[PDB]
Design a protein around this ligand. Structure first.
Ligand SMILES: NC(=O)c1ccc2c(c1)nc(NCc1ccccc1Cl)n2CC1CCCCC1
Lengths: 447, 380
């Protein structure tokens, strides 16, 4: 079968190393594009070719569209993998890659635009039969009588959300008519300033939901499959801390119900590659909020429970190959837990950059370590706080948690502040040990 | 479960055992020589006891010192690992006479199987095929077993350990290439019946020579196998935790029909020795970096700044890669071997890279003489 000869890894850190490994397993030549502050990245040191695309600030490196495309052209690369974050959900970038004759390892640019606009995305999901949060089902105008009527029909509390927003950014809870006009007005102003798009919509506000998300894969040959779910509720201020697969309390019947709807939605929108349907789960019911049109950070928990290498599937799809597995070949087996490891201060939660003086990774049966860090490595201040991901699998949830506790005790990261101690606390939490804690749990636990 | 156990071993296996104990909530007692105070498992153990000076005869092979440490710490069981006293029937007999649980078979089974004459007679009786014959180009194929010593016994597929130097395994893999589900079931059932017939208790391995679609029994290792992780990857069974459950007097919960072979796993033994002359290379590891990724399993006590002592064997770690198929497991091993950094000492990492890149290994089914023919070494 035909495979991509050479690709540009348009990312950094752990995800860039994750992509480099998948490339090497498939015999794909790698081009590591990097900022001047990232010359010592583990994947840069393992890459077949390297191109320094600019200085440390992301604007002149990882978000630098001409420099990334120019690197693909000079090295003779055929495709670009955007990873997560940066330009991965940037439709202009995907269009420019397509326009320049290189393969964008993701969905069509118009699919990114469709799902990136939250109002259009909900309408497409509702039409496809995916359950959505009751809401305005269209943008809000300036007629406050019409806005009060939508709030009445939905039932308070409600949430005002930016169509150009996403991932908890660009939203405001409204509990009564008195706060409605000002809340809409503030959300609009914030959205205009942040996204240069003042469009807002209204949604029913769910008080105690769980964040449950469905993993999908769709090829260019008409196949679209669901790879169970992940529970990503263990979060703080919209930042995921712990993710797990499958989600506790989800039955095979409920898994089948939601998964089939997501797979059908892929067919209807002509989805291609890896994707994630994010839902709020409350009182046995799923409610769509948004679709992630790229690989997710927490993808490894899905890989452990299904045996499917999601990055290798992305590369295969992009090369024009069919999905390597059929739906009937996707089986949920055992349980996996992921602890994100951050170079962060436990009091401020702010990134804690610096030089790692001593480093030791955990090992053992069911223990997977996803990280670019090594002894002597300097965590730069220019980017996000995540330095690694510790993933533990077991035949059941109890075994996965037991292995995580042991793995966190072997993990040594000196010279910088980390959330390792917090991760140990979460694993020891009696409510986490029972499972099914909602999205507000971690914040309530911390204070 | 067993409240507290003495890990009567060292290095990677002692760390392997400690992790299984911690998962089950079993307290650990790390008995160590004065040269092994800095072993990773010793630093992670709940309690530690120095059992003597550096030579194994004075420490790891010192029965009164091990028993005394188990008595003073209030332990109830002893895991002997592999090597050392694991297959010493007098040690197993004394552990039990002292009132402790021996994490292994009965002393009589160790004796029965430890003597080739009585072992072969027990196998002929049990219906296990033996050497009737000249086996010029055989493959080393071995069957993993678990028996509770209560009448239940299961086989957990096979391993191919044909890549050898001076009769020491270098690469191991599971399942064995070319072994059909019919052949697996045939040999496996005879091994499970043999466990019942000899009253076997715990983990064990039946080693065979495999040539022209036929098995020929050589010997039984009456203990956990070094290469046990490749079987664990393909079955999902934690073999050390099963040893611990059996020793606690729990019957096997795993039924034969619950044992499924999925994917493929390869193990590369990592040795502190020269990759060409095989001169042992003890010494301080000045820089260390372990490989990572999907299907990558690293089994080692080594760390940056740790000194590999000159007193013991050269095996410092085991690199185990799994995949949905043999090709994926080999591709993952190549990637993992490139990430593995061990500086300050000589290792066989470069030899392992050559073995993974060998076209006959990539094809599979190379015989027991292959590695030495590739390297130009004379058998002895
Ligand atoms: N309808 C609601 O109750 C509701 C509540 C929270 C919502 C939520 C809905 N939707 C989102 N995110 C998407 C979004 C934000 C802003 C504008 C548009 C979108 Cl789609 N969030 C944040 C996510 C992320 C953190 C934990 C799970 C909840």
């Amino acid at each position: 079968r035909h495979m991509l000869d050479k690709i540009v890894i348009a990312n950094r850190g752990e995800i860039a190393l994750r992509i480099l490994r998948a490339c090497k397993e498939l015999g794909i030549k790698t081009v590591a594009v990097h900022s001047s502050a990232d010359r010592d990245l583990k994947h840069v040191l393992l890459a077949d070719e390297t191109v320094c695309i600019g200085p440390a600030p992301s604007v002149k490196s990882y978000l630098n569209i001409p420099a990334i495309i120019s690197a693909a052209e000079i090295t003779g690369a055929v495709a670009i993998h955007p990873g997560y974050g940066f330009l991965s959900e940037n439709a202009n970038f995907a269009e420019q890659v397509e326009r320049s004759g290189f393969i964008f390892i993701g969905p069509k640019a118009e699919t990114i635009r469709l799902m990136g606009d939250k109002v259009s995305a909900i309408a497409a999901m509702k039409k496809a039969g995916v359950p959505c949060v009751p809401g305005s089902d269209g943008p809000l105008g300036d007629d406050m009588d019409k806005n009060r009527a939508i709030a009445k029909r939905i039932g308070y509390p409600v949430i005002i959300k930016a169509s150009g927003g996403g991932g908890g950014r660009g939203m405001r809870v409204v509990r009564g008519d008195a706060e409605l006009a000002q809340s809409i007005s503030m959300t609009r102003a914030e959205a205009k300033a942040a996204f240069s798009n003042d469009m807002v919509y209204m949604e029913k506000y769910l008080e105690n939901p769980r964040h449950v998300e469905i993993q999908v894969l769709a090829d260019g040959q008409g196949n679209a499959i669901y790879l169970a779910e992940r529970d990503c509720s263990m979060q703080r201020r919209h930042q995921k801390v712990v993710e797990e697969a499958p989600a506790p309390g989800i039955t095979p019947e409920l898994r089948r119900y939601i998964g089939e709807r997501c797979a059908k939605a892929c067919v209807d929108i002509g989805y291609r590659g890896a994707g994630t349907f994010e839902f709020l789960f409350e009182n046995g019911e799923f409610y769509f909020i948004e679709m992630n049109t790229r690989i997710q950070v927490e993808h490894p928990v899905t890989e452990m429970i299904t045996g499917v290498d999601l990055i290798k599937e992305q590369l295969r799809i992009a090369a024009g190959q069919p999905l390597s597995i059929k739906q009937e070949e996707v089986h949920v087996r055992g349980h996996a837990v992921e602890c994100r490891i951050n170079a962060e201060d436990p009091n401020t939660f702010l990134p804690s950059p610096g030089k790692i003086t001593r480093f030791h990774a955990p090992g053992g049966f069911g223990v997977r370590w996803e990280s670019h860090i090594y002894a002597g490595y300097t965590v730069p201040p220019y980017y996000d706080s995540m330095i690694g991901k510790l993933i533990c699998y077991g035949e059941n949830r109890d075994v996965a948690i037991a292995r995580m506790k042991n793995a966190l005790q072997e993990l040594i990261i000196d010279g910088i502040k980390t959330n390792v101690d917090l991760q140990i606390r979460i694993m020891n939490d009696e409510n986490f040990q029972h499972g099914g804690t909602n999205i507000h749990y971690l914040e309530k636990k911390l204070g």
